[PDB]
């Protein structure tokens, strides 16, 4: 009972799994070998003499970034075929990942996910982590959704995307892999959390005050997002929320399932002890329209739903007071078909302290998974890049060369066009 399976694909998937499974290891007390010196059931198992194997698949067509966990300390933690690798990288090619070289590794991925689901006595969700900006994260990741939605139909599939940033790309064919991979995260995904790298850069710049953060520091905060997300699945609290209730009291009409993340007790030790990080101040920094983890301003969008996950020494009287002061402000606005728009959930477990990383010791936390119509702009910015490139048929010989017909470019743009059209239609 109470198991969730994380499914990492793409190189950013392995690295985000190195931080997330790290945090799950501390948050139940597992040593680096896999031994505690049953809250752990969602993430780890019990293999006899205290062994604790994680419930993950690390999936990549390029062996290099999955080899560093196979050669570091945690070959002995992860089961050695739960780290499925390949030979050639998909190489920023959605065609290569989805049609050509992803169709030989997809057998080992589905076989291992099946074995990781047979030892479950009631499974809540599939927390798939990926990055839609490249090759195997856009390709094989999409195909894995096609196979998962047909063998596990009733199963909910959460998905933490890493959607392309506006001015920062680190890839020039990235607009092609983003637009062409919308259909996996529109019809075969029940929760689509949209993250991008720049918003984590800004949070690290002004809140944590690391001026020059690395991707490993970006994986700090996204690890804190899933810990507060699966907080009620593992430790007791005043109000509990499971992944069935995230996708019920937050998700409107079924195509609109695109949510945004905002953790906000982000602070480091030079600031931390000078201020009261109580319930009122951490939730005002949560609704602040510069701490969104999307580079997507909510001040031109309407909040359709919000999910506050307070986590620590938080009293429910202060939660109901904090939702009052955020409801009385005009800069925060809601759709008319929403008298109640908050699913508050409290976990008694304090936020896990970060020795040697970037955060500090805080007694309470908050994370928002909020669906708004502001998210109709993270795809409009990528429309302009797609239409500019596909006007001159740029970069499309690489796609058509492995068996990706030129047709799919047009109705992937058209599918995102109906996605945009669906978003201002709700906000009328």
């Amino acid at each position: 009972m109470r198991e969730v399976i994380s499914i990492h694909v793409g190189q950013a998937g392995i690295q985000i799994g190195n931080a997330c499974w790290e945090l799950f290891c501390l948050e139940h007390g597992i040593q680096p070998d896999g031994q505690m010196p049953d809250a752990f059931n969602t993430f780890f198992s019990e293999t006899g003499a205290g062994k604790h194997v994680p419930r993950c698949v690390f999936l990549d067509l390029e062996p290099t970034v999955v080899d560093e966990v196979r050669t570091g300390t945690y070959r002995h933690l992860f089961h050695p075929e739960q780290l499925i690798s390949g030979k050639e990288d998909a190489a920023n090619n959605f065609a290569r990942g989805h049609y050509t070289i992803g169709k030989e590794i997809v057998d080992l991925s589905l076989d291992r996910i099946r074995k990781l689901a047979d030892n479950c006595t009631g499974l809540q969700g599939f927390l798939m982590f990926n990055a839609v900006g490249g090759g195997t994260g856009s390709g094989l990741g999409c195909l894995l959704l096609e196979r998962l939605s047909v063998d596990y139909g009733k199963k909910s599939k959460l998905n933490f995307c890493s959607w392309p940033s506006p001015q920062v790309s680190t890839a020039v064919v990235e607009p092609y892999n983003s637009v062409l991979s919308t259909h996996s995260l529109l019809e075969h995904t029940d929760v689509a959390v949209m993250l991008d790298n720049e918003a984590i850069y800004d949070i690290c710049r002004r809140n944590l005050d690391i001026e020059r953060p690395t991707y490993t520091n970006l994986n700090r905060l996204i690890a804190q997002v899933i810990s507060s997300l699966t907080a009620s699945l593992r430790f007791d609290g005043a109000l509990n929320v499971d992944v069935t209730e995230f996708q019920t009291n937050l998700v409107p009409y079924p195509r609109i399932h695109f949510m945004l993340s905002s953790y906000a007790p982000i602070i480091s030790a030079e600031k931390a002890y000078h201020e009261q990080l109580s319930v009122a101040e951490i939730t005002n920094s949560a609704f602040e329209p510069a701490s969104m983890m999307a580079k997507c301003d909510p001040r031109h969008g309407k909040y359709m739903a919000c999910c506050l996950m307070y986590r620590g020494d938080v009293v429910p009287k202060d939660v109901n007071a904090a939702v009052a002061t955020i409801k009385t402000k005009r800069t925060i606005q809601f759709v008319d078909w929403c008298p109640t728009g908050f699913k508050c959930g409290i976990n008694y477990q304090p936020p896990t302290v970060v020795p040697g990383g970037d955060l500090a010791k805080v007694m309470r936390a908050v994370c928002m998974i909020s669906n708004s119509t502001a998210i109709a702009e993270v795809f409009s910015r990528m429309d302009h890049k797609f239409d500019l490139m596909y006007a001159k048929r740029a970069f499309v010989h690489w796609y058509v060369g492995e068996g990706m017909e030129e047709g799919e470019f047009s109705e992937a743009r058209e599918d995102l066009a109906a996605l945009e059209k669906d978003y201002e239609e709700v906000g009328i």
Partner: protein, 49 residues
């Protein structure tokens, strides 16, 4: 002889080897008056803060 001097009972009486170990037996969770026994229990739930 192997018989007794007056009772004609075998006095050697042997000991054939048990071919199996006849081991690992039984004993059940059941304890006499048909309830269950007191093995140590578990919790199998979320952490009780």
């Amino acid at each position: 002889t192997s018989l007794h001097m007056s009772k004609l009972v075998p006095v050697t009486d042997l000991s054939p080897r048990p071919s199996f170990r006849y081991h690992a037996d039984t004993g059940s969770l059941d304890a006499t008056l048909l309830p269950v026994d007191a093995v140590p229990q578990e919790r199998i739930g979320r952490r009780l803060i």
